[PDB]
Each structure stands twice: as C-alpha cells, then as structure tokens.
Symmetry: C2
Subunit: 215 residues, 2 copies
C-alpha cells in the first residue's frame, strides 16, 4: 500500500470527521492508506481570499511535514486547490488538488462539463482547467449548509440543480465542493440525471493513484 498525506483546510476536533475524506479514498482505492491532518486556528476554514491566503502558510507547513514522514503524495482536500501550485514547487512528491482533480477527470468523461457548487461561485482553478469546456454552473437554491442536502427540500434542490445542468446539455457534472463528497450526494444525482457526476474527493484519489502507479 501507498501512504497519502491529506490536508483539511478547516480545523476539525472530531477525529472521526477530520478523517471522512481519507476513508472515502481508502474505500474507493484500497492500495492507498490516507493520513489526514487539518490546519489550526481556522475552524471556519477557507471561504474567501483572506482565509485562503491565511491558510497558504499552514497548508505549506503541513505538506512539508508529511514529506519528511515519508508520504508518497499529498492531496490538498479543497476544490479551490489552495496552495497546490506553491507546494508543488516545494516538494519532490506529487501534489494532488481536489479542484484540479475533479475538473481534469470530468474531461475524461465528457468535454461538455457543467459544474455544481453549493453556494460559492465556481472555483478559479476549475474554471482555468475547464476553459470554454465549462458549459454551465448551477447550485442548490435555498441550501446554505451542506447538511441541508440531507433534508427533503435540500435534497430536492441539488437534484434539480443537477437536472438544470443536464438540461443545458452537459455530458458530465463535476462537484465543486468537497462537502458534497462527504454526504455522498453524487450517486443520487447521477441516478437522477444519468450522466457522470464527479466526486472531488474520489477524483483526487484516482489522480493520487495514477501519480504513484505511473512508476
């Protein structure tokens, strides 16, 4: 097995919660063992440029500590790919980003890509990779919290947002929020719209596995 150092850009106390992402990847890809660690003094995580730029140094410090411990690769578990470019320049191992992973892998399924966010607009890393292949973007109206997607109305909201994208002719939907990976909404949506719905956390695992196996 391979060991991945996964970074959460939001401070989590519940060990169980902090590890939800690595468990998702390990489940999907057994060859991989994921050690998840979060940044400190940032319980609200990254939701703008300040919190982003504020986390850049913490992310970089953790990523570095993971390499000295022998991790085969890094996965910055955030759709915004916070500090992924910077960290790559610094480490001698692959640096995977949830944002570039979900959008890149979506293209391998269809060139007409639609993006489904929660509340935030579409991350710039995803817009960059998708180019004019980003046909459209949508989100669940009325849903402020990820946990709202679990409710009957919130569930309906995201399903409809998926439907709206499919109706715009997209061939594949990339989810732009790692919190959607956490609730496992993707399979429900794919079920609904009948086209691939890409989970950012699972996608990062696939990319992490390719990086390592391609040697």
């Amino acid at each position: 097995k391979y060991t991945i150092g996964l970074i959460r850009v939001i401070t989590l106390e519940d060990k169980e919660i902090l590890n939800l992402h690595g468990r998702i990847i390990e489940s999907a890809f057994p060859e991989l063992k994921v050690v998840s660690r979060c940044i400190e003094d940032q319980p609200k995580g990254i939701y703008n440029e300040e919190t982003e730029r504020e986390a850049e140094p913490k992310i970089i410090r953790l990523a570095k500590e993971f390499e000295r411990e022998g991790v085969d690769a890094i996965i910055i578990s955030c759709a915004a790919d916070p500090a992924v470019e910077k960290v790559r320049k610094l480490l001698s191992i692959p640096v995977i980003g949830a944002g570039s992973s979900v959008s890149a892998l979506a293209l391998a399924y269809g060139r007409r890509v639609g993006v489904l966010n929660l509340t935030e607009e579409t991350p710039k890393v995803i817009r960059s990779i998708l180019g004019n292949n980003l046909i459209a973007e949508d989100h669940p109206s009325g849903v402020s919290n990820t946990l709202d997607l679990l409710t009957d109305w919130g569930r309906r909201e995201v399903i409809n947002a998926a439907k709206r994208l499919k109706e715009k002719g997209v061939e594949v939907i990339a989810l732009g929020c790692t919190g959607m990976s956490t609730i496992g909404i993707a399979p429900v949506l794919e079920e609904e719209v009948g086209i691939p719905v890409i989970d950012p956390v699972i996608a990062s695992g696939a990319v992490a596995l390719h990086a390592l196996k391609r040697r």
Copy 2:
C-alpha cells in the same frame, strides 16, 4: 478483478504484440484484466482522416461485442479517441479514450501542458485548449522503432527538452506508440517534469470510472 475490453486500432497478427497495451495497464493497475482485440483491414492503423473513417465502424463493432460479452469498461487505445463519442452514445458501460485520458490527466499535474507527438489529435487540442503551451516531436523520426535506436532516442529526448525549455509543467505523450517502447520514464528522468503516458493514463480513468460507481 474487473475486465477491460481494449480496442487496438491496427490489425495485429502476433498475440504478444496485440496484447501490448493490455499488459501495461494490468501491471500499473492489478485490479484490471485487459482483453485486447484489434480491428480488421487496418494493417496500418489510423494515420489520416480517411483511415480513421474506415476504422470507425470496426471500432463501434468491437465495442458492441465487448459489452455484450460482459466487459466492465471499454478503452479505445488510440490518442485520437476514434469513435469514442459515437461509442459513448451506443454503449452504457464506461468508454475510455486514450487521448482524452492523457490530456485530462495531464491537467491534474499542471496547467502548462506540452504535447510530444510523432500533429496533435483534435481531442487533445480540445481538452487542453489554451492550456496547451507547446507541442513537439523528434526530428528525423517517423516511426516508434526509431525511438529505440540511439538516434531516434536522442531525438525524442531532444524534443522533450525543447518542450521543457518552453516552460511546460507536464508533457502529454500524444502517440499511443510511445507507450509501446516505454519512452515516458526515459524522458521524465531527462527533462525532470511529469511525462504522462497515454496507455497508463487510460487504465487510471477506467479504474476511477469503475470504482467511483461503487
């Protein structure tokens, strides 16, 4: 293990040579068993637009069979993604193109992509888009076999260095024939940046395509 139905776009007599791409994928990803089969009357494979047309329905044919016979996913082993789109509208199981795979996976390593060809397939140009910084190919070389010889080797290594000098962060090999001679690691060692092999890239998307639905 899952079973991948891999389509070779060139008529291959020898069993060893026909199952080249399949073996590569199995070694990189032990979770897949690759059944390789080739199209007929395609001795020279797909090189122009007419030859591509000729092989299209032959691709679509092998695809129908493979599904019918129970393969988990399809892989059209050719960086030009021939019939891929058509094959996706016909079959319901995953259909993976070697070209869309190599270009899409490259984007996950960096945005400034370079393509090392033997010109660039339409599929690769569409997925890379404006992220396609530069492309090249070894001089004097016109066949995979030359890349084995000390000159055809230095040639492809020079082309990759020129792409490296153009500032690319990742290089996508745009020919499925380079996966054969296993040139990728030879270049990456030289130029120092990820060199994405298309055959291995396809195995990776195929495994994601399967694991992600479970």
